[PDB]
Design a protein around this ligand. Sequence first.
Ligand SMILES: Nc1nc2c(ncn2[C@@H]2O[C@H](COP(=O)(O)OP(=O)(O)O)[C@@H](O)[C@H]2O)c(=O)[nH]1
Length: 382
Amino acid sequence: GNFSEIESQGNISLKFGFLGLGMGGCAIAAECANKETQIKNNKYPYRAILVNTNSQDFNKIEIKNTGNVRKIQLEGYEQGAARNPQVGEEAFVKHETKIFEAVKQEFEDRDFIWITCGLGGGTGTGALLKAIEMLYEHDYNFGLLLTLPRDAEALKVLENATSRIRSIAMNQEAFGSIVLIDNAKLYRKFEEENPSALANEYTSYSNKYIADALHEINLVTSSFTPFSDTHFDASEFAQVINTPGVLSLAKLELKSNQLDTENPLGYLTQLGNALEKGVLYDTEREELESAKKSALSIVTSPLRAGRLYNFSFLNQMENFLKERTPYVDERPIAPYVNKHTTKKEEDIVKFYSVVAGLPLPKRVSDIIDEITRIKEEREQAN
Ligand SMILES: Nc1nc2c(ncn2[C@@H]2O[C@H](COP(=O)(O)OP(=O)(O)O)[C@@H](O)[C@H]2O)c(=O)[nH]1
């Protein structure tokens, strides 16, 4: 995930802060906060506060971005493998004053905060609702960056996740977007693109993959030259990220010759598949249909832009999004020119979309059925 070229000539739309809770949430938050960029006068664009109980692992969470990443240790509530949310909850409440003082100072210059948490654990999951109340009570603009557990994590972790996800959705109107991450999906993605990969490379891969997906859309929305008057800029991006409900990201890269405007079915089908098989989780038409907001940006070279962004293409794209998110407040189709595209990448056309205000995905229901299976077979066994 090297965005050096783009960063040296671009910028990020929003100054994100990450409030990590628990091991996984802190690992993801740290991965994002430690990102180094080639952005003018902004080597380290992100900040983070990592809240977790003491442990060797938590001590192990590196930290490159100095000063912009602070660890807050939940003294006295180390939980071990108890996987008990009630304890995580008590921990957060007990240390709330210390935590908020840290949040207050570190996030003063932030535009938006991501409460980052791996659903299923004790500390993170347990502290989640309290953390949300804290940011809400102090009027921060914030959203949730959450992972859903793999089936192998078993019963307790799945119930822990199911419990919070349910409560989150019920109270979703109280805050911004919920960027869901399906660990099962990403685990599979890893195996497939790295068949000969070993288990020791997954965690790093998934955390970098997540951080890169968020940073990339943050970059794309403020680093290129708009071809027209329709934009998906920092302002619009903020509008979308602040929309309640689940948020889905998609990205498709095609070679210029695979994008036929006289025979659009081919590339429109690929775009449709990219939107459903999203970056962080998998969605479907039924879910997309109820989107509250959506935006799609297209980026290509000076060489290709002029010939691509014609009436036919733009109209086909307008139609495409209209069929996918029919009831959206606004769905801009925003073509961009990357004026500094290399000769080597001259033919590439990139598509980026963000869909917001979505319902919980199918993976949440599959987890419920996995929990249901286990409990019912346990009864039959009895
Ligand atoms: N993507 C990702 N997910 C993680 C990571 N660590 C843990 N998780 C997930 O988050 C869930 C909770 O684990 P953890 O954060 O360690 O528990 P906690 O410290 O008690 O909150 C697990 O069930 C995993 O699915 C990580 O480094 N990356």
